[PDB]
Design an enzyme around this catalytic site. Structure first.
Site, mmCIF file in Angstrom:
data_model
loop_
_atom_site.group_PDB
_atom_site.id
_atom_site.type_symbol
_atom_site.label_atom_id
_atom_site.label_comp_id
_atom_site.label_asym_id
_atom_site.label_seq_id
_atom_site.Cartn_x
_atom_site.Cartn_y
_atom_site.Cartn_z
ATOM 1 N N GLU A 35 0.853 -1.208 0.000
ATOM 2 C CA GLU A 35 0.000 0.000 0.000
ATOM 3 C C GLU A 35 0.887 1.256 0.000
ATOM 4 O OE1 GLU A 35 -2.862 0.469 -0.771
ATOM 5 O OE2 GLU A 35 -4.219 -0.960 0.010
ATOM 6 N N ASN A 46 -7.026 8.572 -5.609
ATOM 7 C CA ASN A 46 -7.784 7.505 -6.203
ATOM 8 C C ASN A 46 -8.621 8.107 -7.368
ATOM 9 O OD1 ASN A 46 -6.915 5.755 -4.095
ATOM 10 N ND2 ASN A 46 -8.405 6.841 -2.727
ATOM 11 N N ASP A 48 -11.799 7.992 -7.808
ATOM 12 C CA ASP A 48 -13.055 8.538 -7.343
ATOM 13 C C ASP A 48 -12.943 9.933 -6.776
ATOM 14 O OD1 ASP A 48 -12.092 8.073 -4.832
ATOM 15 O OD2 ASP A 48 -13.584 6.589 -4.292
ATOM 16 N N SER A 50 -11.145 10.697 -4.128
ATOM 17 C CA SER A 50 -10.629 10.574 -2.786
ATOM 18 C C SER A 50 -9.099 10.344 -2.902
ATOM 19 C CB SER A 50 -11.286 9.476 -1.993
ATOM 20 O OG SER A 50 -10.987 8.229 -2.537
ATOM 21 N N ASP A 52 -5.789 8.391 -0.679
ATOM 22 C CA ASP A 52 -5.389 7.428 0.331
ATOM 23 C C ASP A 52 -4.142 7.975 1.068
ATOM 24 O OD1 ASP A 52 -7.312 5.517 -0.441
ATOM 25 O OD2 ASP A 52 -5.691 4.246 -1.360
ATOM 26 N N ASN A 59 -8.526 5.915 3.163
ATOM 27 C CA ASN A 59 -9.140 6.886 2.243
ATOM 28 C C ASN A 59 -9.959 7.964 2.852
ATOM 29 O OD1 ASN A 59 -12.168 6.518 1.636
ATOM 30 N ND2 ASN A 59 -11.390 4.378 1.488
#
EC number: 3.2.1.17
Length: 129
Positions: A35, A46, A48, A50, A52, A59
């Site tokens: 990650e 991301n 969308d 958002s 992380d 998120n």
């Protein structure tokens, strides 16, 4: 901070992640590796809209507030920047809520795609824990 592998394992183990919701310590180390590459400052947008944040790529739509994610719920009640600290306490606390949300560690698609089903114990090899 860029954690060493065993350094991170020791800290996650201290904060009670080993076997949390039945997920062994190697699962958590592996998830962090893929990650964030063990880097607490890691941030990634991301698709969308958002972002992380931190060691476990938490998120900003569901879990933390970053002030730029429409629909934000902030279920960890934390600013996302607080998840970038050298001290992993906040990330761990939030990750415990996440992994309790219904789908276990599948919530981290990098865990699902790179860790799940694999020999995750290798990630704690050589560590004095």
């Amino acid at each position: 901070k860029v954690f060493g592998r065993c350094e991170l394992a020791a800290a996650m183990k201290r904060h009670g992640l080993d076997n949390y919701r039945g997920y062994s310590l190697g699962n958590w180390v592996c998830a962090a590796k893929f990650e964030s590459n063990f880097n607490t400052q890691a941030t990634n947008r991301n698709t969308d809209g958002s972002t992380d944040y931190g060691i476990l790529q938490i998120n900003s739509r569901w879990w933390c507030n970053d002030g730029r994610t429409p629909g934000s719920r902030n279920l960890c009640n934390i600013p996302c920047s607080a998840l970038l600290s050298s001290d992993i306490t906040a990330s761990v606390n939030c990750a415990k809520k996440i992994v309790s949300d219904g789908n276990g560690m599948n919530a981290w698609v990098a865990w699902r795609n790179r860790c799940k089903g694999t020999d995750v114990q290798a990630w704690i090899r050589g560590c004095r824990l």
